Amino acid sequence: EEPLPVLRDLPRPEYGELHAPVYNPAEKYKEQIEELHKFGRYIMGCLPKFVQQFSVWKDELVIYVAPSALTQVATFLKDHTSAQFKACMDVTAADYPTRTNRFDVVYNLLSVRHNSRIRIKTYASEVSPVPSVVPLFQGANWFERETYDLFGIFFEGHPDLRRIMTDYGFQGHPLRKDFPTTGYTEVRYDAEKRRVVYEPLELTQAWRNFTVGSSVWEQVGDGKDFTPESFKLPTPAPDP
Amino acid sequence: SMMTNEQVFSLAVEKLLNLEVPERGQYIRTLFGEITRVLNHLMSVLSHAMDVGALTPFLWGFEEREKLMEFYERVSGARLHSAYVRPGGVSQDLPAGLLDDIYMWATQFGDRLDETEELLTDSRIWKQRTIGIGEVTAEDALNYGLSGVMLRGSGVPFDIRKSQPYDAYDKVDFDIAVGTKGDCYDRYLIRMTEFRQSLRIIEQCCNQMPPGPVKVEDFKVAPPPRALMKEDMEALIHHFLLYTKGYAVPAGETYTAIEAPKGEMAVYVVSDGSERPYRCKIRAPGFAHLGAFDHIARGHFLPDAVAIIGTMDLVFGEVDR
Amino acid sequence: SSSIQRTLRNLWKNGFKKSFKQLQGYNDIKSGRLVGTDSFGNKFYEVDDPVEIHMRTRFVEYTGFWRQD
Amino acid sequence: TDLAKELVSGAPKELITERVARIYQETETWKIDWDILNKGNRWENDLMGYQSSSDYMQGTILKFDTREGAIRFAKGQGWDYYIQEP
Amino acid sequence: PTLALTSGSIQGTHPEGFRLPRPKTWEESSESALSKATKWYLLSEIFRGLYITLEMYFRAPYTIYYPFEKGPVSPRFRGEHALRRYPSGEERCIACKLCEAVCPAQAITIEAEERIDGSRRTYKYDIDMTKCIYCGYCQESCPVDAIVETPNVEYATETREELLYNKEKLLANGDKWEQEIQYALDADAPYR
Amino acid sequence: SGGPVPVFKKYTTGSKGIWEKIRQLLTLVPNRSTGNPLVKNYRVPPPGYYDRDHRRNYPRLVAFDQTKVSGLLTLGSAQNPRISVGEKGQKELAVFDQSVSLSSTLATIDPKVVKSELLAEGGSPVVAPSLNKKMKFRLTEESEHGMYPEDYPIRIFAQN
Amino acid sequence: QAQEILIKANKGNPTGLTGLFQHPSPRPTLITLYKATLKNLEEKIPKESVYRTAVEAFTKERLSIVENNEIIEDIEKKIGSGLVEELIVQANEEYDLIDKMAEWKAWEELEEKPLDDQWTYFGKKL
Amino acid sequence: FWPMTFGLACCAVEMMHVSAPRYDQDRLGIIFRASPRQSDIMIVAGTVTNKMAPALRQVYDQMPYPRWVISMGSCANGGGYYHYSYSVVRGVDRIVPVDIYVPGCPPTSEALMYGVFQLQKKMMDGQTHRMWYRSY
Amino acid sequence: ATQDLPPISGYAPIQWKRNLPSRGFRPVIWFLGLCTATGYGFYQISLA
Amino acid sequence: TNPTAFAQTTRYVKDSTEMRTLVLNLYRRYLRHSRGFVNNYNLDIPASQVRTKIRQEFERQRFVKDLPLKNVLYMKAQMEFQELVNFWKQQCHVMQYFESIKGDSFVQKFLKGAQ
Amino acid sequence: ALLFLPFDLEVSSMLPYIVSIYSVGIYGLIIFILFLLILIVGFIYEFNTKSLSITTILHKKNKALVKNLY
Ligand SMILES: CCCCCCCCCCCC(=O)OC[C@H](COP(=O)(O)OCC[N+](C)(C)C)OC(=O)CCCCCCCCCCC
Ligand code: SF4
Ligand code: SF4
Ligand code: SF4
């Protein structure tokens, strides 16, 4: 039955010298870096016919495979007990027109058993078929459809591949680097036709390209190496 | 769940930048990470209940959203779209007297949850609409990529706040509710437990908020104070350069996931060494949940599709983006 | 805040002429202490009534009788 | 190499028949932009003075790491292009 | 020595008692048949839910009477834009074009030159209010506090043209709302 | 713990006098607050370098092809050397300057070397490393977590 | 020979995971699956493989736990790979992985090498 | 004042808060109707995409007269954040007539209520039957 | 002093565990009252 | 899960003879469903005109030589067919599809500003 | 819906008894019970046959995964 206190009038402490703990955030991933280097090396040893190379950055491990090796490596990472990556969380692509094969099809897998994440990278072109992992991961059904819709990647074996984001009968694949960000056509309602119609694009205010202020200098340096000593090549000893 | 979305992008950029938020900044993102989680579950649980036919709980809890969005508006100036969580910390510090209002709200919110459970939890009509509806096996939950409450309702005890901790979630205590039957009623109970577990975290953050800077002490990423900007030449240069060129991010890529209220939300960001992201793929938890709807809703009747839609917590801006 | 005792109490303070204006635009008969009047003519009041809820301690009286902007 | 990838790209025919691209090294990367329209590149909006346009490629600037990549990509799309020698 | 010898893991181990116990039968209940049938036929929990609802009927509602009453606002609130002046009447904006570059929606258009008296001043400052996302980046980037957002929200218009603010409109807002702008700046001064 | 708290200890507006006794008589759970914030307590005051250049010391992206991976099984590592010395040392490392298949390397090498570097714990398979080794859970009981009793079809997992 | 073995049950008590039922004969099944795996390894995959070496290392030790323990909880606590119903599924899927690996011939030379510009991002080759 | 339930995006959250107890549009006679036949106000609260525009126009055309349209938020007004997107209509007034424009991202609940009050003010100035007498 | 911080003693603990205590008579009593009311009701119907 | 109606599994055809048969089968399906297109989409033209329009689109890609382009063209032609039959396209899009269609001289273009 | 008609007629058949309960006395009361007891066999029949359920066309059955080992 006591009155409620005025929490505004309760005393507060006073603090002085407070800047930061000066430390490098990359150091806390050191243990993770070594363990993923060993696990990636294990996968390369188990599949020397399919794994081209692997990379470990902080706490992320990437396995680089060919299109004709994706189904095997995904099956190995799905069923092997050491790596029970049962869940495919995301399938996506990135466009690099400078390469012979533009696209980088990326598969992020999750293992709830071992609390681990792994990434699979494979490549593709505008006409090169890519195996579908829908038979392995039914959760890849929509992600592959989205990847095709916005890039145009031929997922062979997909049970139902079609547009999922763009309008019906939409021409073009928006996330390609050569597709303009405003597209080509726009809609409006035509009073004479009594319906909404597509028309070629015209903008009252054209998009302004402030991006030309790209630095004439490079900002970030060459970086600091954090490769585990267990994975660096040994150096020959000096002369006796 | 606005501030959680900003956090996953901020975490990905901070990881690429090789920076880390100071101690007080991490707690603020945890405090409003759980305020945002409550804001989402009020929208999700009560709209799902309203679609089933329980109109009244929607009205009660939306006033709780009004009180929570008042905290959103006081720290940022927008009730909904608060660009408050930014790479390096938060845009502005907590105003004077905010924690007392948050703590005052928390003293009553337990009764609000209990009154909501009075109309739903033990109701025979509510259980008839949710028990045995939208059953998901633990195997099918993993194969279809379900996460969060969809995965946890099927018996799998997995939470990203525990699996890959971030931003002072390691410095608080909370429990995860796990279902056993994987239907709409199990996920309703889990989302009601998370209501109380967030309130448990909110109280701890209010009692453990440390002093210090809220943003990273680096003017090549974070804006300098205005008083320093107008007296220090180097501050004025960094202020000029931040708002006219941004900050460069070292070349690379990352896949950073958080425990969003809908589930696992992740971003796949590719950096080309410039001040613009080369690629940004946003992994939406609702996108994966809706891709399993045909597998889940088969057999059920048309009214059951309404329940299955509402138990997935589908916000289609997240799905489509 | 929804009782008839509060309404009758505020009805006695304002008088019929002022309360009928509140019965036409405000939808609620309310009383308060005059705080000021702006350059447009609106009159701003503050309520000392202990039964008024949080966000209702300040209210305006507009100049018009049928429309309020 | 010689595939007419413009047939399955989805882009309109004017990129192949009308518009001309430029390949240039502006100072470490090779870029591809499009020559402006003779008419319709810009015109002042009569209402608020905005800069209007009907050129949908005006803001598109491809980036390449090598000269070979820029030429190979342009040929693969059937683009009419000229190389601006550095 | 880890669990790697059996391909196991620390995370793979389920806690003690993870397996669900045996489900109960009909004889293994705690309530009698008549006890469960009385709660069933007489709708025990349904009547309780009605009583909880009837309690709310006697509590104070939350409704405020807009527009006679307004919801709370904070000095950080983002609303209608306005250009600001110094106390002498001179415009604060030096046509520096910082806010134009930051603007995530490209809603700001600035054209500048040298004034007749020789000052670095703009002659064209337009904000497309139908394109702005009311995000406050222009306010944060201004080095002279020229561009601000006032707490105003009630400026809905019949036509979309009226949401194309030019410099004269924006300066008129700054004169109109200068006192209210002063409240927000003074209160939010310590945190900026 | 978060057990029940009396209504007067919550920052809401309650009842007084005879009406508080009536409220306690006709409420199923009388300790529940009304939810209306206190006017006199809530919101009464209205709101109105190189040493620390961690970005430029970012980790460098390093890839490991079959060529270098083969070198580690054959020549050892800089932490656990198995390489020769002198001009013989540089002759063996220059072997891995061009394409060297790992499957060919795995064909002719001592399993005592494969089971020490490629595998671990004496031939044990390498298991997917965990993102957080502190992730553990334990079942609890209603007297601990305060949630639904056991008859409800959910369970509560603590930190353990 | 018809060794008809139940991998996943569709009836019985619930295990705590939705859709996963209690296996009525846990220990005899794991022995049969483990032993048929080791025999299937020696018959399909050459001894130079690293997958074959690693699988035999943990298949024997997993089998050596079921052969020397009667308490189901003790077996689970000594392996740490889920329940025994889960352990049976893992053993089944590993057995099916040997058939595919033997078919794939995953131990041989890299089938398709990448192009020179393939794993190069913005000029810095990976 | 019976608007049609047409919440497209984050602008719909503020429209749901108008029906919340704090503002309680129902006290003003405002009820949201699912069917266009029972509605006379169309509140476009959210981004209108090219895939949605024909559906939006069809839904608008099925409202019996008299009908009014409220455009809420920057997306519906002129495109907003997604103005330069390949799949966004740059303003809902390219498809349907708009009677009032409510600004904000999102407009607050009070900003929307003010917009409704402006429309109700214009509706109270209607002279349809005196138009027949004095103009026809 | 310049930042919002918790009080030195901290905030008082709040209620977050479920609080829905059972209320009402035992089901036996409700059934008896139903039979008691039915018996008295038919007695009055019989008298009428 | 199950695929939608009229869905085909994606397969990369490696034989030009087998590809030719698949194209001819699909062309027949377009002709057979032509009367359905007029019914569902309420077109103002006879089904005979619809079949003529279908043939023109197939005649455009008559002389495509590269096999990889054939598969992508075939795959996209199957997706469009599944879109039309299932009535996923809105009627406005199909009406505008038939709205499609002498070039001016040099001076004529010069006078109006050309292109 | 079809079984509604036989039960609707049974309910409508009690109307003569409602307004003549006193006159028929015990004889009519026993006949009234016999009328209801014959119709209660239809109620037992519908319960045991489960004829008042919903005729779904899909059925969810849990297949068992088995391995034909060698
Ligand atoms: C008088 C005419 C109007 C009401 C008629 C019907 C009332 C309910 C009868 C069945 C009760 C029952 O079955 O009781 C079962 C339950 C409780 O028993 P338990 O769960 O074992 O309790 C656990 C152990 N205790 C006994 C220690 C608590 O009681 C109730 O939930 C009572 C709820 C009543 C509160 C609301 C009253 C107003 C309702 C609205 C009226 C218009
Ligand atoms: S608030 Fe943001 S979007 Fe609006 S004008 Fe300012 S910078 Fe542009
Ligand atoms: S940032 Fe301020 S001073 Fe610079 S152009 Fe914008 S309004 Fe003017
Ligand atoms: S205007 Fe802003 S708040 Fe409204 S729908 Fe568009 S992005 Fe969301």
Question: If you write DSSP's letter for every residue of H21-70 in order, what string do you get?
Answer: TTT-GGGGT---BSSGGG-SEEEEES--BTTTHHHHHHHHHTSPSS-EEE
Closest-CA residue to E94 (of E118, E71, E121, E74): E121
**Distance from the alpha carbon of residue I4 to the mean position of ligand 2, in angstroms:** 29
- Where are the alpha helices (H) located in I1-48, listed in sequence order? 27-47
Contact F35, F12 (CB under 8 A): yes
Say what angle helices F66-75 and A30-46 make with each other, to 10 degrees: 100
Phi-psi region of J87 (alpha: psi -120 to 50; beta: other; left: phi over 0): left
* Distance, CA of E170 to chain centre: 23
Q: Which two tokens stand for residue K16?
A: 């003569």
Q: Can you read off the two tokens belonging to residue F81?
A: 């050397």
Of residues B14, B1, B47, B28, the one with CA closest to residue B201: B28
Taking CB atoms and an 8 Å cutoff, what residues of chain B touch H16? 62
Cβ–Cβ contacts within 10 Å for residue A50, how many? 24
State how far the Cα of B67 lies from the Cα of B76, in Å rounded to an integer.
15
Strands D30-34 and D51-52 turn out to be unpaired
Task: Tell me which residue in A37, A220, A226 faces F55 most closely, judged by beta carbons.
Answer: A220
Listed residue (A108, B158, A84, B142) closest to G92, CA to CA? A84
Phi and psi, residue H21, nearest 5°: -60, -30
Asked whether the beta carbons of H107 and H43 are under 8 A apart, the reply is: no
Question: Is residue E14 within 8 Å of residue G82, measured between CB atoms?
Answer: yes
Cβ pair B84, B90 in contact under 8 A: yes
**Which ligand is the nearest neighbour of the Cα of E126?**
2
Q: How far apart are the C-alpha atoms of D81 and D71, rounded to whole Å?
A: 9
What is the C-alpha end-to-end distance of chain J, expressed in Å?
A: 51
Using CA positions, which residue lies closest to atom 8 of ligand 4?
A: H10
Residue D28, SS3?
Answer: coil
For B:260-319, CB contacts with K below 8 A are 298-299
CA distance B193 to A91: 32
CA distances (Å), origin A44, targets F67, G54, G103, H120: 11, 13, 18, 71
Instruction: Tell me if A114 and E9 make a contact (CB, 8 A cut-off).
Output: yes
Tokens of F64: 């490991």
D31, two tokens: 């870029």
How many Å separate Cα G97 from the centre of its chain? 7
Closest CA of chain A from D82, distance in Å: 17
Tell me how the structure was determined: cryo-EM
Mutate to test the pocket of ligand 1, among E38, E44, E50 (most ligand atoms within 8 A of CB): E44
User: Distance between CA B164 and CA F132 in Å, rounded?
Assistant: 6
What one-character DSSP code corresponds to residue C26?
A: I
Taking the C-alpha atoms of residue G88 and residue G98, their distance in angstroms, rounded to an integer, is: 16
Side chain identity at C53, as an amino acid letter? I
H or E element in which residue F157 lies: strand F154-158
Instruction: Please say whether the beta carbons of G40 and G91 come within 8 A.
Output: no
Using only C-alpha atoms, chain D has a radius of gyration, in whole angstroms, of 15
Which one of H22, H27, H121 has the shortest CB-CB distance to C67? H121
Instruction: Give me the helix-helix angle, B184-208 and B98-120, nearest 10°.
Output: 160
Q: Is D4 helix (H, G, I), strand (E, B) or coil?
A: coil
DSSP string, K16-67: HHHTTHHHHHHHHHHHHHHHHHHHHHHHHHHHHHTTTS---S-----PPEEE
| H22 touches C: beta carbon within 8 Å | yes
Count Cβ neighbours within 10 Å for each residue of G103-119 and write b for 16 or more, e otherwise.
Answer: ebebbbebbeebeebbb
Chains J and E touch (3+ CB pairs under 8 A): no
Tell which residue, G16, F146, G86, G23, has the closest CA to residue B152: G16
Cα within 13 Å of Cα(A73), Cβ side: 32
Whether cis (ω within 30° of 0) applies to the bond prior to E67 is yes
Residues 6+ away with beta carbon under 8 Å from G122: B251, B272, B273, D65
Q: Do chains A and D touch (3 or more CB pairs under 8 A)?
A: yes
B19 neighbors B215 (Cβ within 8 angstroms): no
Ligand 4 contact via H73 beta carbon (within 6 Å):
yes
Q: Between the CA atoms of J56, J58, J64 and J70, what dihedral angle is there, to the nearest 10 degrees?
A: 150
Q: Whose CA is nearest to atom 18 of ligand 1?
A: I26
Residues lining ligand 2, Cβ inside 6 A = E 102-105, 107-108, 127, 132-138
Pocket lining: H11 vs ligand 4, CB cutoff 6 Å: yes
Residues I21 and H17: their CA atoms lie apart, in Å, by 32
**Candidate from A97, A100, A127 with C-beta closest to D64:** A97
Distance CA B261, CA E24 (A): 34
Contact B311, B297 (CB under 8 A): no
* Alpha carbon of H128: minimum distance to chain B alpha carbons (Å): 38
Identify the three-state secondary structure at position C60.
Answer: strand
- Rounded Cα gap, residues F124 and F133, in angstroms: 19
Distance CA D41, CA E127 (A): 23
- Provide the 3-class DSSP secondary structure of residue J33: coil
Hey, what's the torsion of the CAs at G41, G46, G51, G57, to 10 degrees?
Answer: 60
User: Is the distance from CB of B202 to CB of B39 less than 8 angstroms?
Assistant: no
What type of residue sits at position H5?
T
Which residues surround ligand 3 with Cβ inside 6 Å? E 93-99, 110, 141-142, 144, 146-147
Residues C60, C44 contacting (CB under 8 angstroms): yes
Position B275: which residue type? E
Structure tokens at C9: 């109490």
Report the DSSP beta bridge partners of residue F59: A224
H121 and chain C: CB distance < 8 Å anywhere? Answer: yes
Dihedral sign for Cα atoms in the order C21, C25, C28, C32: negative
Distance CA J58, CA J28 (A): 11
Nearest residue to E94 via CA among E116, E110, E82? E110
**Structure-token pair, residue B108:** 């009553």
Find how far residue F7's CA is from the centre of its chain. 39
Dihedral angle computed from the Cα positions of residues G42, G47, G50 and G52, in that order, rounded to the nearest 10 degrees: 0
Radius of gyration of chain A (CA): 26
Q: Could you give the C-alpha distances from J100 to E79, J81, J84, J94, in angstroms and in order?
A: 46, 19, 18, 11
Question: Under a CB-based contact definition with an 8 Å cutoff, are residues H120 and C25 in contact?
Answer: no
Alpha-carbon span E110 to E93, nearest angstrom: 11
Contact G95 K67 (CB under 8 A): yes
Strand pairing category for H3-4 and G124-125:
unpaired
D47 lies within 8 A of chain E by CB: yes
- Per CB-CB distance under 8 Å, the chain E contacts of D50 are 109
